[PDB]
Design a protein around this ligand. Structure first.
Ligand SMILES: Cc1ccc(Cl)cc1O
Length: 162
């Protein structure tokens, strides 16, 4: 297991524009195109991201290319964030994957609501952190995925991903 395999499980792979769990146009392995309800705006974002006229469809290679860009940018964002970097750098590599996963899903603005969880994770109070993480819109809206990510934070193992 690694961050790519982990996010591939959690996000799936779809080659045509679809709506994510929040109703937002998306493609590939959880590549958000836009929060706009306008499908045309989404198609324009897709063409911009791929560099050709896609008419709402991409190939697996193209999906994986966006995925690599998206995972990388997520990590680099964490490292630039004064609130996130110290927590991230305190963690072992398996737990760092859980961190990347959560940021990939909800963005840094999403993880801003997790200040108390962050503190417990930095303190390595793993069961306490796991309890606090589940007290969230995140958990309630995507409980099966959040359970997997939280187990990863709690144990530092890949048990939740088989
Ligand atoms: C919970 C959590 C901790 C540390 C980082 Cl870097 C991200 C997270 O989404």
């Amino acid at each position: 297991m690694n961050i790519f395999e982990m996010l591939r499980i959690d996000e799936g792979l779809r080659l045509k524009i679809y709506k994510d769990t929040e109703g937002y146009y998306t493609i590939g392995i959880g590549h958000l195109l836009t929060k706009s309800p306008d499908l045309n705006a989404a198609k324009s974002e897709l063409d911009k991201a791929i560099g050709r006229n896609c008419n709402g469809v991409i190939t697996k290679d193209e999906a994986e290319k966006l995925f690599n860009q998206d995972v990388d940018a997520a990590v680099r964002g964490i490292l630039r964030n004064a609130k996130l970097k110290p927590v991230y750098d305190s963690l072992d590599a398996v737990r760092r994957c859980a961190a990347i996963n959560q940021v990939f899903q909800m963005g840094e603005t999403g993880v801003a609501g997790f200040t108390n969880s962050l503190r417990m994770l930095q303190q390595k109070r793993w069961d306490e952190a796991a309890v606090n993480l589940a007290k969230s819109r995140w958990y309630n809206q995507t409980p099966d995925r959040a359970k997997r990510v939280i187990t990863t934070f709690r144990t530092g193992t890949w048990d939740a991903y088989k």
